[PDB]
Write a protein that binds this ligand. Structure first.
Ligand code: KE1
Length: 230
């Protein structure tokens, strides 16, 4: 885990007047970029990035399936990108506290502590995770190396497609914990390059209420281009 060639990307974060880190994981190597590199090994609430693990747990334990319509009426996959209806809260209650805690410990996600409220522990605590831990988790998902069904991992990966450009596929999940102080913003995912190679990323930055949600994607894309990952 090493600071990368950071001269330019550091300035990208500086221009937004906030602190952020970008963690990049290729085969074996992790590199750190941004203007607040200590964030990479700092624990934060995962916020909506936990939807990835919620979905894996719910699908693996047959508490839902990819075709179920949650009463706008929505599937699990549509709810991955949009939060108009509380699908993942409902799924967490179906899973229940016992099974959720067992699965979170089996995966070893972050500090693996979910407390006693099964439907909000990922937003206000006590569950916390570092950006390095998030990039390792999503790298395992991208490579079908998590200890879940191969089909479940493929189904969750398919829910996470963000953009496709000139043969590159960008997968990922945003999160924003706006009700804690300081606010935390996430964009965690991976690039599938045209030849099949995977480069995983975790962007983590301090948010403020006036920022557009798209600031995370903007910083990510500019940085990935500067690093020649896309
Ligand atoms: C997950 O972190 C939350 C979910 N994700 C998300 C995002 O990453 O952009 C938004 S939070 C952010 C968007 N606008 C602000 C807002 O208050 N709402 C439109 C609700 C905050 C979205 C709510 C959530 C499921 O925890």
């Amino acid at each position: 885990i090493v600071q990368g060639h950071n001269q330019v990307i550091h300035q990208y974060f500086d221009e937004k007047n906030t602190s952020g880190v970008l963690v990049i994981q290729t085969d074996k190597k992790i590199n750190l970029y941004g203007n607040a590199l200590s964030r990479a090994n700092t624990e934060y609430v995962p916020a909506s990035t936990f939807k990835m693990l919620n979905a894996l747990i719910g699908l693996e334990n047959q508490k839902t399936d990819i075709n179920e319509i949650f009463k706008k009426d929505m599937t699990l996959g549509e709810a991955m990108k949009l939060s108009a209806v509380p699908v993942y809260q409902e799924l967490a209650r179906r899973i229940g506290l016992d099974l959720m805690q067992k699965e979170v410990k089996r995966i070893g996600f972050g500090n693996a502590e979910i407390g006693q409220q099964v439907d909000n522990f990922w937003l206000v605590g006590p569950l916390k995770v570092t950006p390095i831990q998030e990039v390792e988790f999503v790298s395992q998902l991208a490579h079908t190396q998590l200890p879940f069904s191969e089909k479940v991992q493929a189904n969750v990966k398919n829910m996470l497609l963000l953009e496709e450009s000139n043969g590159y596929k960008i997968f990922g999940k945003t999160g924003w914990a706006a009700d804690i102080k300081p606010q935390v913003g996430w964009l965690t995912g991976w690039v599938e390059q045209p030849d099949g190679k995977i480069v995983a990323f975790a962007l983590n930055m301090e948010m403020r209420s006036e920022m557009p949600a798209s600031i995370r994607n903007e910083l990510l894309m500019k940085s990935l281009k500067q690093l020649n990952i896309i």
